[PDB]
């Protein structure tokens, strides 16, 4: 009997992982990694938030059991998530039109959403932005859903090409899913204005798309409430919505896998039937979600003083990111960049497309020890007042 | 446009949940819940282990980041898992034939296995015991794999009907997966002897089955090393294996979702190829596993003092269960049960089929506040010295 595994073809190697290895082995003292995928503070660390440490001590001191949570996780975490997303006092919440399952990260929410749709609806196609967040295609394809891309970013001119966006969406059919990033578009940082969100929401009602909002950076854009405006514009207009949310970045809980899939339907009965089937999708997967991270979030948000410490931490991160965005543009100019990079100050979150070609990216690594990903995506949280000048000199030298 | 969710049908009611509802609204003081799915101590609680609390204190003091780990999770947790399963000095480990991905529970492991097999192999069917763990079917079916049942338990006579077992497996084709519970068969508590494990392993090699060992109770049967005998008998004989393991029960870490999927192939290069595609299955699912629980486990297993504490805790749980099994049988006898329940003393782990009819189970609930599931499965960890007499009196009354 030949082995069942004997003829398996290896998955292609992950280029970013190979880059990370190369960086680790790089002995040049001037190296800088702009290709990283998480937040980093001014010292180049990704620390545990003090609010999180305090919450963890509280749990250490007060938790008396690890017995299984239900399929939908910690109820208080679901309530806190819904309040963050829709606002406390939302008619949506009051009308009991929303149900939330705590999931292993926003990624887990996306997969749960995909399995639920594939098994319980006629959805056959999910639309994502160009450029896309690479993991979306893998997740949706895995449930048998086709993924198509709509027009979004004008890379030559560094804008969200809104007219191209809405025209390209004419190809989306009633009952297709259309996925939008809630704020801090990953990887461009280019977000719809509120007026644009309202136009998209109206169009979605007219065409009959089911909107899916991926929101993993609430609070990194302009603020907690402002970053939810687009989601809330959709929520005001639609009978139905799916939200895949994450606390990986805004609570710095990446590896604890804390997020949620929220369903919204026309009425309480409908969301309840749908939610019963989403629970079935969970039962066939990882069964119930990991408690530690969600418990931390609930513990922070439920307590006035702790919540205050966390919101200041979040504000700190957002403002450091905005500072590096401004310092990057100003230093490029100072170093005599032969181009305008103002689009950087107009973009939200830690990621932007630098507009560098793959050849310039390669040159940046080999010659200058400045690491970005092949697409030219840079993480501005990889920048500091101390590494900014040489990094920008390098970029100018490559233009 | 009409809604995507409107025509969704409500999932069938979850009887277990409904029984838990009933139990909670039951205001009677003599209640006894034998239907629970977790360990309970002599006071009826499911405590956090002392070794776990100590480990969590240490992580609170020491952790400086929660940034993402790789798709396979924490390397040290993977190694500690492999040691537990295969033993120190395993030729298989020495030959670099195994790879382990940390997963959200044994459930996550089983789903990761299913997706990996469906996408990368010609496996069409997974064989499971009659009866088996309730969630197996949904998990494997979700990945597109047919689930078939093999003969296992003789309910009238309370035995593992081994001849029926091996004859029923003649129907399993080369390349099919055959799933065995590693120890403490859930829900019968009836396990193969070592000799029967060896016979099964030989048949498997001759027939060309791919064995999958589902092990969630290592340490609850006879002891850590003893409970691995069956898995190791398969390991000795096979070029290929899959193990889905769980720390939910032996570490009391249920809600932290800590388990693993381990692949074994003929050699290192082959398992590398296979494991790379397993990682791809993870990436399309929840992306990376939850750190807290696995970190706790690695912390405990890597420290001699802590490990000794945990082992004593595990021994205490195993022995409380064995003692309740013995007390149950002895108390039924002296309460004049019209039947022999001696089979209970021989069985491994917290579950057995009581052999009670659904009429008797209903009557136990309605008249006596004694709760079991419809199948008559009981969890002996729901029994205590203080509740044993009234419990056995009720059972006797319904016989």
Swiss-Prot record, chains A, B:
The modification N6-(pyridoxal phosphate)lysine is found at residue 249. Pfam families: Aminotran_1_2. Its EC number is 2.6.1.1. The keyword Transport does not apply. Keywords: Aminotransferase, Cytoplasm, Pyridoxal phosphate, Transferase. Has been used to construct a 2,4,6-trinitrotoluene (TNT) biosensor strain. It is found in: Cytoplasm. It is an enzyme of class 2 (transferase). One of its GO terms (cellular component) is cytoplasm. It comes from Escherichia coli (strain K12). L-aspartate binds at residues 37, 133, 186, 377. Its cofactor is pyridoxal 5'-phosphate. Its main location: cytoplasm. Belongs to the class-I pyridoxal-phosphate-dependent aminotransferase family. It catalyses: L-aspartate + 2-oxoglutarate = oxaloacetate + L-glutamate. This is Aspartate aminotransferase.
